[PDB]
Amino acid sequence: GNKICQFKLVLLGESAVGKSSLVLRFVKGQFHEFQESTIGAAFLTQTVCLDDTTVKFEIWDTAGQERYHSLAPMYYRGAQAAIVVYDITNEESFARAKNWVKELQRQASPNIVIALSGNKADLANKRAVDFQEAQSYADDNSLLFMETSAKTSMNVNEIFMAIAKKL
Numbered sequence: 001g002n003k004i005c006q007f008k009l010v011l012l013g014e015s016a017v018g019k020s021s022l023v024l025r026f027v028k029g030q031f032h033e034f035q036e037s038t039i040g041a042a043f044l045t046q047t048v049c050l051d052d053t054t055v056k057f058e059i060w061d062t063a064g065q066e067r068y069h070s071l072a073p074m075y076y077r078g079a080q081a082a083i084v085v086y087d088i089t090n091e092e093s094f095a096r097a098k099n100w101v102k103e104l105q106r107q108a109s110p111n112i113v114i115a116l117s118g119n120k121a122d123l124a125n126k127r128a129v130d131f132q133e134a135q136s137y138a139d140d141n142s143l144l145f146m147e148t149s150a151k152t153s154m155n156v157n158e159i160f161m162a163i164a165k166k167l
């Protein structure tokens with residue numbers, strides 16, 4: 001097809017859950033075991049083919065440390081979609097993700113599409129967040145949920161493409 005669409009996506013979540021790794025995997029097909037914590041935010045773009053349409057993603061990978069919380073609106077204000085990321089081995093990160101979802105539902109665009117990534121799924125031998133519990137939470141809050149692994153690539157392209165399909 002000759003149709004081209006572009007949209008703004010923001011990633012939010014507690015520090016160390018794998019936001020930068022998820023974007024690097026999607027955009028560059030890379031994964032770095034030693035990824036440094038992000039300062040403020042990083043910007044990346046990727047263009048994909050979505051059933052007859054060329055979709056360009058403008059992605060804001062926010063720094064998740066609490067000291068950067070006040071900067072979040074600068075990145076989500078004009079976003080058409082968000083991926084709130086947690087680490088399946090860390091329940092506190094899952095609780096933090098729920099608070100990011102609440103903030104988006106109250107302060108971002110009322111039409112924003114929100115996805116929830118249960119990342120580091122390759123570490124299921126240390127799971128702390130039950131898949132079904134997270135799925136139920138996502139269903140009750142109208143969030144597009146998938147467990148992902150930036151390390152193995154599991155569901156990485158899938159979650160970004162599913163979001164694009166719903167915009």
Ligand SMILES: Nc1nc2c(ncn2[C@@H]2O[C@H](COP(=O)(O)OP(=O)(O)NP(=O)(O)O)[C@@H](O)[C@H]2O)c(=O)[nH]1
Nearest residue numbers: 015016017018019020021033038064120149150151
């Ligand atoms: N096993 C595993 N490790 C992962 C996965 N995603 C990220 N990691 C690791 O987790 C650590 C933190 O990842 P990173 O992408 O920097 O996290 P972040 O959410 O961007 N942190 P910040 O918000 O501070 O910038 C890194 O050592 C990275 O390699 C994953 O899916 N599986």
Ligand SMILES: [Mg+2]
Nearest residue numbers: 019020037038
């Ligand atoms: Mg980061």
